[PDB]
Design an enzyme around this catalytic site. Sequence first.
Site, mmCIF file in Angstrom:
data_model
loop_
_atom_site.group_PDB
_atom_site.id
_atom_site.type_symbol
_atom_site.label_atom_id
_atom_site.label_comp_id
_atom_site.label_asym_id
_atom_site.label_seq_id
_atom_site.Cartn_x
_atom_site.Cartn_y
_atom_site.Cartn_z
ATOM 1 C CG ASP A 143 28.888 18.124 -79.846
ATOM 2 O OD1 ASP A 143 30.111 17.867 -79.831
ATOM 3 O OD2 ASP A 143 28.392 19.106 -79.254
ATOM 4 C CB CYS B 240 34.029 12.367 -78.486
ATOM 5 S SG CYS B 240 34.248 12.596 -76.712
ATOM 6 C CD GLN C 207 31.079 16.511 -72.442
ATOM 7 O OE1 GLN C 207 31.034 15.948 -73.545
ATOM 8 N NE2 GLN C 207 31.498 17.766 -72.295
#
Length: 297
Positions: A180, A214, A261
């Site tokens: 993550d 994801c 990200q």
Amino acid sequence: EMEKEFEQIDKSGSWAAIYQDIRHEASDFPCRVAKLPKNKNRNRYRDVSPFDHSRIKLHQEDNDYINASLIKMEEAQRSYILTQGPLPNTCGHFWEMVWEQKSRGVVMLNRVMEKGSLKCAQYWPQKEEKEMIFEDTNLKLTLISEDIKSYYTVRQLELENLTTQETREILHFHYTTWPDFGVPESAASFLNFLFKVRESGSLSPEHGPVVVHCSAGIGRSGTFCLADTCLLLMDKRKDPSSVDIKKVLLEMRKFRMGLIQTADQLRFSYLAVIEGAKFIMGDSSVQDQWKELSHED
């Protein structure tokens, strides 16, 4: 050129600024359908929405909304569907999308639980004898087989349209060690995984677009797609120099927001494309080296 640029950025320690420059230039398009009140429980994250112009529409007259984007890469001649990790109420929608879009593969880059929280619904069956039926979309899903390696798992699934009784084989490629908001453990293991997806046919033009996800479907999902498209462009020209990663990423962000990200995911995408370039430019032996370095068992 990307390896020269790479070092330059490393030496000046400016990955954070390079990456925020991309955030600043990235496209902005409306996401009106995503924000309709009737769709609030179809979105996993408030701040991650498909643009209206590129969103995947479900073929139902009721509500065609799913949080999923078609990333259509014109020059590279490859499309991808990027979507969020399905929610307990959108697992039917997810497989309806797979069916209607004629996808052959699903690439899952997250675990169901990460950092002590649930990132994704258990949307596929874990046991052959316990198949799943999605009653809203009238689809049946059976686990056919599983091949567990040290850091990823490949499942053969059978998806059945219960209304017509047609069945299709879906390949599920599950990267299980990608954190993550993180990066893969090595260029090698990521590349070993991408080439196993490639080798399966699921990225092929005779099939529908691969479905990549994801938790939000932008970070790890964006890294995977960006590396693949870069490598494919390099392949079509045999010209690593012609490939501009930032431009490719900005082109992808026309179709879904937020792709990549963190600045370290950007840096890792450079790492993966640079390394992958060795295979594209004629060194077939590197593929085996990645497999060994990945320690898949």
